[PDB]
Design an enzyme around this catalytic site. Sequence first.
Site, PDB file in Angstrom:
ATOM      1  CD  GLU A 128      31.234  13.115  28.849  1.00  0.00           C
ATOM      2  OE1 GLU A 128      31.893  13.048  27.784  1.00  0.00           O
ATOM      3  OE2 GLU A 128      31.784  13.092  29.962  1.00  0.00           O
ATOM      4  CD  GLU A 237      31.695  11.526  35.543  1.00  0.00           C
ATOM      5  OE1 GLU A 237      32.726  12.134  35.148  1.00  0.00           O
ATOM      6  OE2 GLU A 237      30.942  10.871  34.780  1.00  0.00           O
TER       7      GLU A 237
END
Length: 312
Positions: A128, A237
């Site tokens: 991220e 995810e």
Amino acid sequence: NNLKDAYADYFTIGCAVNMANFNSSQQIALITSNFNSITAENDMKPQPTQPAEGKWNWENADKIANFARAHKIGLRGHCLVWHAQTGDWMFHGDLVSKEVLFERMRTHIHTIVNRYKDVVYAWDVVNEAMTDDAKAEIPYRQSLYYKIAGDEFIKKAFEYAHEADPKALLFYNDYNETNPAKRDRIYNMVKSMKAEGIPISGIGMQGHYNVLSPTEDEFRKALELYSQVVDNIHITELDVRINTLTPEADAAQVAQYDMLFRVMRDYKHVISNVTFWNGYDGDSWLDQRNYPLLFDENLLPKSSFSSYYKVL
């Protein structure tokens, strides 16, 4: 014969697990029946494993790794370098220099990768690192990592991880992966870092989607784009929330999962792994209002399980 067997020819199927998963018998039967890969939901991230310099905390990660060794399940190593869930001691109280950050980084990466490289086949090395979307201004999330070291911490993280296990796939991992401004920025950074030789084995698309979220046009655009710069992609995810119990919601969800897995099968030559972010609707990190997964609050298969499982 679950998801993993239906998708044997296409890619592995994983889920993220925690101490309550690896507890009860019905839940373990669900994951062994359906998944040939596993990710540690929390117990392998930086703050949980190294809450203080030199005070390693291996217990929960050991149990998960031992589960993966014993049961012949591949293990995705979740999260070497992340602005989140990381000890503030890593950076500072006064901010450390680049060099000190890098020594801290190398020591954390090399210690945990060497403890688990026997089971771990892939790592989310950097998590991220790019900003949510707004050529000109900086493409990078302005974390302390970026503040201290600019672009360079991303380069170092991959080189230390590759240094610690050369045979592992190393992923750059991110959410909002289909958003076009963020999609383009993830592509450039990975293209430019691979050009400078940094060993970024593949791109991690988090797949925290929803029932109207990514249009299959956007999904496909991201996949083809990412596909021209890495030889491996993991959907890492995956969940699709019904928001932003009813029969209408279920239909919308079944429809997204059908498309989502349709495109993923179409890109089976890039996608090695599709991992869901929790186990069942009852242990989803979103909490039960979003009903995001393929198994319900009682571990039973949802309508979207059968739709994704019966193709061709």
